[PDB]
């Protein structure tokens, strides 16, 4: 949990010093918060499905 | 076509356009559309509504193409501020839509004479 | 060009209602003058039908109102209970009806199994029948030019205009072009009718200023959320001059101004363009196709831009130059009506999609490899802030963005270039001291800076503060003195000049005890 | 036993500085020692008025609350409560500004052409039309000097037939001697209203308004920098 | 407890019939007990109807003599004499026609020239200047159609400042459409007074009651 | 042997803010014991060391007092009180800021028509006329790229014969290519002179903003008007 | 103590009938009996002059040669020789006519329109560009009367930045009254060189010249 509650903060800062012109949550902060809310389990299976498929949408692109 | 002048005190709006000729070797066309508006009811001193009504309208090209704003320019290392004008401090034929024009009249309110300010072009004289 | 802007083309059916928003520059004249809604009849003469001075025409009595939003900088006209004689051409505007300041609206009401789908998406068509047709040819037919010509017939045979597209109760057809909007008939010896109506999606109205910034939030579906999205502009004819693309394209004029932000968990991203010019006003179609181009069948989303040349954003220097060894002090503007915010500064890196990671912000976080060579003053206040960056090399040449954390978008860019020369303020390189005994540093400065105010500041992570410091006026020299050097008197020092509020060249020296 | 609340007069707001609200209590045949309460207690203590006998008795105390130029303009609701012995429940009233406030249209209308073909006394008209609060001031200027109020005639502000909202209109009439109108000076109508920007607007008519112009265009070619 | 012999209106004196004189008795105390007597008994149909429309705890009795315009334009002094039981001397008052009657001077002023570029409506004005009895009647006409009294606004008849005699003034405004003006209809003010032969002065305006530029270029 | 105190240059005083005063002593026969006191010595130094850039039978000793433009532009006398071991009476040569000034009237003149017909190179002229002190700077620009000094000619600021006060005039000539003109590139001429308040005056010309070949004036008579929307 | 030899003055060669080749010294303090000799002596002698001291002596004995205009055009080399007793060896000076001349392109230039809106004076410019020997004349005529030299200003003949052969330029200027311009009489700049057969280029200008612009006034109400 303490490793996870600082993984929201290590992410939310990095979605703030890298995308300053933004209003939404760029999926890594949304992965990192759901892995905090598990520590429910089926609600985070989408975000690992989206990212991995978007990284299988990087193997050709 | 480009816009050379947008004077709002004489309401002159000179715009121009080089109509080229790819078929004529050195016979080109340089247009000079001018678009005067003659106000036809404005006074002579437009800020003073006692003056006679203006009937002559003189439009010199040099007195309305003038650029009385300073510019900045670059000379080989530096930036210098120039005054690219040659004639500045005019009389005005039309009011400006964006400018507030006022007249001070002496009304009384009984035992005094309060110099009140009236609005000659309201919808442009609103405070904040 | 009149600075008023609103819908070029409105549509409805009878009995309906409309609400037409027209946008004007929000100067203090435009927001107190009369707003009208006249009708452009023939021979000449736009007769006022409603106004912002109380006058409501007898035609529009009891079924229209004009309400004016000055803070938004717009006004809107609500027209109820339409009819086929409410068609034609209209004008919205400000002022006297004949003197310009108007937009020509063209309002055409029309007369009222209807499958209404958006462009590029997919359709379910429910085809019921009579059950004496158990194993027959469950098909569609299209009536092209009022003639029944085959489309898909129950066995995989699809006409090759629709290949890889349609499949077989109810049928489902993907990737709707504009050539799928006819009158279909399902048939299993009986026939059923259903008419497809693919909709072009309506443009939003973006009303930006000149030299401003525009944010396009392109929330397409999450079922298209893996495909390479794009941002076309629409030409005068039929094509696309694609501005940005997720496949590594960027338009050659939008170098330094564009920024495609990463996606969301459901596809919705945003493009941010800054420094708008007069040729940027147009129609912008954001879409999603694997080709990286607007082909046919992609679910578009369109905006209609207007670059107001009556712009409140001040004409700033859009290129700053500093020598290789010198300093630059750019001025970044923001909105005077919001002072207290966090204020950023970027270095625009292209090469992935156009990101822009922060170098400094106002609350005191300066990036790691810019320690001692970057500072964000809040001087001069009321709509500007300085950003000083010194010790320049040719790895600083690029575009830098002056963001804010405010609800307004003055997100300007400015390019720093590195020209040949030598800096004005001449300090030693990296001096050292000995503990206890004193340290004095010289800072020469040429004759140009002889009326300016000189300082020496110790650079913290939260900004300088000017310190002791003498200023010899005959010999051009300003000098530091750290009298009894301790441990907490180290780090960078900056000797630069200023003029009340408008800071100038600065030069850096680091002290090592 | 009734109470009315009178908004401040307009020529106090526009021309001068101070403007007191008035609370009037008509039906009072008793009580030389009653009290009023004004809820905007911004320091300046409200002032009770005289006995001031109305028709058939009814010593009508009134309360003049001064300094109402800052809350009344920005829109603060004033409230006056009045205690009196004939009922324990004290009679109340409230007021504020209007929020609609359409601007007036001033029109200055020259004489008809069958009054100046007599050389006796011509008649000029001033129409302030179409403003939403019913209070105006109409004043007249001969050139730049204000005529007295006993030279012209102004009708009361009246409500128009409806072409949209509720709007009002007032007219005035100035009889100027014909040798002034012929010799060529200007007369001005000056309308004061709350809805106006700088509290007064002004139109001006003279003999020549109501044409040989000589537009001269020097240097139509030639260099334009 | 006062008495007022209010004159007939001017409406029925020009057009209608019931030119009734209204002897109103306002401010008597208890319930009733009135007796109203007049001098020209020429259709004496005594009606009272004492209402509550009296503004105090003392009523009114609005006595009416009906059908008298033929004795009115002549000038016999009508005298109302009311016996009320709270005294014995009757409330006696008289009234007749007015001596000096000057006649109106109708001026139908055009629309002001900045109203026509707004295209909303236009504003016709009808000034009626200098009449010596106070009562007047303004009507408006389009073509020959009389317009109903809620389309035009008519101010009162106030005294004008004069160093001559006691004369008055009236203004009536008609805002009409812009296309009905711009096409060229004719609009007519009609001011009616008891000091006219035909009893209705009438003026009429249409759109039709010279730029001459000279460009002296270079 | 006469002592002469010259003026700061104008390319220094305007673009650089240096007021180096150049006191020379010409005509010295043999000696070397020259001293240069300066009565406004605010701690600055001198130069000496006579070479032979003279074109005469004798040679001059210089003395350059460094300074910046804030004493000179406010009105302050500088006095090269120079002694020399021939005569016991020392020489003096003083200066101050030259007052009673007149600003230029810059004028930019388009090509003549015979060059636009012969269609090779056109010639733009800049005339700065009527300014009271002799010294003036004429720069040229193309867009805003300041042109190098080796492309245009600039004559000396001679005196013009006028009737009133004595005043000067200077010209300059830039020969540019004809399609550079006809396309419409904006050429600028900058005249910087110390009587101007902002010390520099620009002018800028192109093919559009000078001498058309088709004008058409439209004179919109507007009756109840007077706002210029 | 150098030997300088002058070309004939250009004004002296165009209109006049004499043209003097003149040999002057600068810095001798002697030679009250030393003459000059020239191989172009066509019977006509050399008219000697006074010694004409400069500051602290520095005499300049002038040997002037009149009449000689006609050998100069056809290419004869003139050699001045003086045998003075400061040092025994005599000194020579050799000169001819440079033949690679160029003709002055003369452009008269109208007043700026910013100047004849004020109606005080107007300013006429005469630019003579592109000629290879550096001597030139500029004359200003009003209609056909010559104006005096105290009414116009003539700059010197500067060298021009040119891509090929070195050329020169000279501008001049005349300020006339605005009523004299508006009433319309002509002016002229007459530039004289030696590359001309006519010996005087002449350009004319007046109030109405230079393919006047077509104007299309229209009144909208």
UniProtKB/Swiss-Prot annotation, chain B:
The keyword Disulfide bond applies. The chain holds residues 27 to 159 of 159 of the full protein. This is Immunoglobulin J chain. Its main location: secreted. Disulfide bonds join 9-92, 68-88, 100-125. Keywords: Disulfide bond, Glycoprotein, Pyrrolidone carboxylic acid, Secreted, Signal. It is found in: Secreted. GO terms for molecular function: antigen binding; IgA binding; immunoglobulin receptor binding; protein homodimerization activity; protein-macromolecule adaptor activity. GO terms for biological process: adaptive immune response; antibacterial humoral response; glomerular filtration; humoral immune response; immune response; innate immune response; positive regulation of respiratory burst; protein-containing complex assembly. Serves to link two monomer units of either IgM or IgA. In the case of IgM, the J chain-joined dimer is a nucleating unit for the IgM pentamer, and in the case of IgA it induces dimers and/or larger polymers. It also helps to bind these immunoglobulins to secretory component. The gene is JCHAIN. One of its GO terms (cellular component) is secretory dimeric IgA immunoglobulin complex. Glycans are attached at residue 45.
UniProtKB/Swiss-Prot annotation, chain E:
Disulfide bonds join 23-80, 126-189. N- and O-glycosylated. N-glycan at Asn-20: Hex5HexNAc4. GO terms for cellular component: blood microparticle; extracellular exosome; extracellular region; extracellular space; IgA immunoglobulin complex; IgG immunoglobulin complex; immunoglobulin complex, circulating; monomeric IgA immunoglobulin complex. Keywords: Adaptive immunity, Cell membrane, Chromophore, Chromosomal rearrangement, Disulfide bond, Glycoprotein, Immunity, Immunoglobulin, Immunoglobulin domain, Membrane, Secreted, Transmembrane, Transmembrane helix. The keyword Zinc does not apply. The keyword Membrane applies. Glycans are attached at residue 20. One of its GO terms (biological process) is immune response. Residues 1-96, 104-206 form the Ig-like domain. GO terms for molecular function: antigen binding. It is linked to A chromosomal aberration involving IGHA1 is found in multiple myeloma (MM) cell lines. Translocation t(1;14)(q21;q32) that forms a FCRL4-IGHA1 fusion protein. Immunoglobulins are composed of two identical heavy chains and two identical light chains; disulfide-linked. Monomeric or polymeric. Part of the secretory IgA (sIgA) complex that consists of two, four or five IgA monomers, and two additional non-Ig polypeptides, namely the JCHAIN and the secretory component (the proteolytic product of PIGR). This is Immunoglobulin heavy constant alpha 1. It comes from Homo sapiens. The gene is IGHA1. The chain holds residues 125 to 332 of 398 of the full protein.
Curated annotation (Swiss-Prot), chain F:
N- and O-glycosylated. N-glycan at Asn-20: Hex5HexNAc4. Disulfide bonds join 23-80, 126-189. GO terms for cellular component: blood microparticle; extracellular exosome; extracellular region; extracellular space; IgA immunoglobulin complex; IgG immunoglobulin complex; immunoglobulin complex, circulating; monomeric IgA immunoglobulin complex. Glycans are attached at residue 20. Constant region of immunoglobulin heavy chains. Immunoglobulins, also known as antibodies, are membrane-bound or secreted glycoproteins produced by B lymphocytes. In the recognition phase of humoral immunity, the membrane-bound immunoglobulins serve as receptors which, upon binding of a specific antigen, trigger the clonal expansion and differentiation of B lymphocytes into immunoglobulins-secreting plasma cells. Secreted immunoglobulins mediate the effector phase of humoral immunity, which results in the elimination of bound antigens. Immunoglobulins are composed of two identical heavy chains and two identical light chains; disulfide-linked. Monomeric or polymeric. Part of the secretory IgA (sIgA) complex that consists of two, four or five IgA monomers, and two additional non-Ig polypeptides, namely the JCHAIN and the secretory component (the proteolytic product of PIGR). This is Immunoglobulin heavy constant alpha 1. The gene is IGHA1.
From Swiss-Prot, chain G:
N- and O-glycosylated. N-glycan at Asn-20: Hex5HexNAc4. One of its GO terms (biological process) is antibacterial humoral response. Residues 1-96, 104-206 form the Ig-like domain. GO terms for molecular function: antigen binding. Signal peptide: none annotated. It comes from the Eukaryota. Disulfide bonds join 23-80, 126-189. Glycans are attached at residue 20. Coiled coil: none annotated. Keywords: Adaptive immunity, Cell membrane, Chromophore, Chromosomal rearrangement, Disulfide bond, Glycoprotein, Immunity, Immunoglobulin, Immunoglobulin domain, Membrane, Secreted, Transmembrane, Transmembrane helix. Constant region of immunoglobulin heavy chains. Immunoglobulins, also known as antibodies, are membrane-bound or secreted glycoproteins produced by B lymphocytes. In the recognition phase of humoral immunity, the membrane-bound immunoglobulins serve as receptors which, upon binding of a specific antigen, trigger the clonal expansion and differentiation of B lymphocytes into immunoglobulins-secreting plasma cells. Secreted immunoglobulins mediate the effector phase of humoral immunity, which results in the elimination of bound antigens. Immunoglobulins are composed of two identical heavy chains and two identical light chains; disulfide-linked. Monomeric or polymeric. Part of the secretory IgA (sIgA) complex that consists of two, four or five IgA monomers, and two additional non-Ig polypeptides, namely the JCHAIN and the secretory component (the proteolytic product of PIGR). It comes from Homo sapiens.
């Amino acid at each position: 949990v303490e490793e996870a509650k600082k993984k929201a903060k290590d992410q939310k800062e990095e979605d703030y010093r890298n995308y300053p012109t933004i209003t939404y949550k760029t999926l890594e902060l949304e992965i990192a918060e759901s892995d905090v809310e598990v520590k429910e389990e089926t609600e985070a299976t989408r975000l690992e499905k989206i990212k991995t498929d978007r990284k299988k949408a990087e193997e050709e692109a | 076509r480009i816009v050379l002048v947008d004077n709002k005190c004489k309401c002159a709006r000179i715009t121009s356009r080089i109509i080229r000729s790819s078929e004529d070797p050195n016979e080109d066309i340089v247009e000079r559309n001018i678009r005067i508006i003659v106000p036809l009811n404005n006074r002579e001193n437009i800020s003073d509504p006692t003056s006679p009504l203006r009937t002559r309208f003189v439009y010199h090209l040099s007195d309305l193409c003038k650029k009385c704003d300073p510019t900045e320019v670059e000379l080989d290392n530096q930036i210098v501020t120039a005054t690219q004008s040659n004639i500045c401090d005019e009389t005005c034929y039309t009011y400006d839509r964006n400018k507030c024009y006022t007249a001070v009249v002496p009304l009384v309110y009984g035992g005094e004479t309060k110099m009140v300010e009236t609005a000659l072009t309201p919808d442009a004289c609103y405070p904040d | 060009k009149s600075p008023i802007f609103g819908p070029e083309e409105v549509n409805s059916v009878e009995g309906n209602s409309v609400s037409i928003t027209c946008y004007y520059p929000p100067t203090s004249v435009n927001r107190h003058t009369r707003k009208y809604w006249c009708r452009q009849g023939a021979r000449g003469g736009c007769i006022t039908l409603i106004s912002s001075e109380g006058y409501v025409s007898s035609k529009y009595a009891g079924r229209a109102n004009l309400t004016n939003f000055p803070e938004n900088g717009t006004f809107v006209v609500n027209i109820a209970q339409l009819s086929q004689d409410d068609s034609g051409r209209y004008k919205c505007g400000l002022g006297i009806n004949s003197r310009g300041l108007s937009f020509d609206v063209s309002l055409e009401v029309s007369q009222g199994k209807v499958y209404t789908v958006d462009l590029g998406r997919t359709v379910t068509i429910n085809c019921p029948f009579k059950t004496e047709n158990a194993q027959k040819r469950k098909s569609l037919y299209k009536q092209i030019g009022l003639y029944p010509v085959l489309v898909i017939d129950s066995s995989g045979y699809v006409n090759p205009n629709y290949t890889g597209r349609i499949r077989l109760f109810s049928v489902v057809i993907n990737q709707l072009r504009l050539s799928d909007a006819g009158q279909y008939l399902c048939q299993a010896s009986n026939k059923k009718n259903a008419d497809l109506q693919v909709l072009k999606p309506e443009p939003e109205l973006v009303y930006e200023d000149l030299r401003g910034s525009v944010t396009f939030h392109c929330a397409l579906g999450p079922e298209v959320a893996n495909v390479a999205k794009f941002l076309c502009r629409q030409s005068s004819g039929e094509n696309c001059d694609v501005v940005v693309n997720t496949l590594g394209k960027r338009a050659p004029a939008f170098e330094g101004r564009i920024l495609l932000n990463p996606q969301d968990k459901d596809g919705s991203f945003s493009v941010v363009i800054t420094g708008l010019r007069k040729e940027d006003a147009g129609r912008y179609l954001c879409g999603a196709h694997s080709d990286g181009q607007l082909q046919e069948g992609s679910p578009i989303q369109a905006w209609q831009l207007f670059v107001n040349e009556e712009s409140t954003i001040p004409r700033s220097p859009t290129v700053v130059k500093g020598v290789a060894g010198g300093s630059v002090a750019v001025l970044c503007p923001y909105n005077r009506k919001e002072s207290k915010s966090i204020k950023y500064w970027c270095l625009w890196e292209g090469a992935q999609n156009g990101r822009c990671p922060l170098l400094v912000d106002s609350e005191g976080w300066v990036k790691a490899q810019y320690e001692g060579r970057l500072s964000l003053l809040e001087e001069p206040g009321n709509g500007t802030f300085t950003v000083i960056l010194n010790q320049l090399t040719s790895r600083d040449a690029g575009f830098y963005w002056c963001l804010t954390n405010g609800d307004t978008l003055w997100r300007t860019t400015v390019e720093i270039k590195i020209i040949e020369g030598e800096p004005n303020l001449k300090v030693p390189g990296n001096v050292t001291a000995v503990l206890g005994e004193t340290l004095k540093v010289p800072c020469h400065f040429p004759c140009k800076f002889s009326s300016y105010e000189k300082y020496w500041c110790k650079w913290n992570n939260t900004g300088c503060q000017a310190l002791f410091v003498n200023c010899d006026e005959n010999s051009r020299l300003v000098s530091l003195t750290l009298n009894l050097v301790t441990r907490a008197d180290e780090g960078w020092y900056w000797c630069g000049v200023k003029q009340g509020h408008f800071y100038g060249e600065t030069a850096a020296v680091y002290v090592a005890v | 036993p009734r109470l009315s609340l009178h908004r401040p007069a307009l020529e106090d707001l526009l021309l001068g500085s101070e403007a007191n609200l008035t609370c009037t209590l008509t039906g009072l045949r008793d009580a030389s020692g009653v009290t009023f309460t004004w809820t905007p207690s911004s320091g300046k203590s409200a002032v009770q008025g005289p006995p001031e006998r109305d028709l058939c008795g009814c010593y009508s105390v009134s309360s003049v609350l001064p300094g109402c130029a800052e809350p009344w303009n920005h829109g603060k609701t004033f409230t006056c409560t009045a205690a009196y012995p004939e009922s324990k429940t004290p009679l109340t009233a409230t007021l504020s500004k209007s929020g609609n406030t359409f601007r007036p249209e001033v029109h200055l209308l020259p004489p008809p052409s069958e009054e100046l073909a007599l050389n006796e006394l011509v008649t000029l008209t001033c129409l302030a039309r179409g403003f939403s609060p019913k209070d105006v001031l109409v004043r007249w200027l001969q050139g730049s000097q204000e005529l007295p109020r006993e030279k012209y005639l102004t009708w009361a502000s009246r409500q128009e037939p409806s072409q949209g909202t509720t709007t009002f209109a007032v007219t005035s009439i100035l009889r100027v001697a014909a040798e002034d109108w012929k010799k060529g000076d200007t007369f001005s109508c000056m309308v004061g209203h709350e809805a106006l920007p700088l509290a007064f607007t002004q139109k001006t008519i003279d003999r020549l308004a109501g044409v040989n112009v000589s537009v001269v265009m020097a240097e139509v070619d030639g260099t334009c920098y």
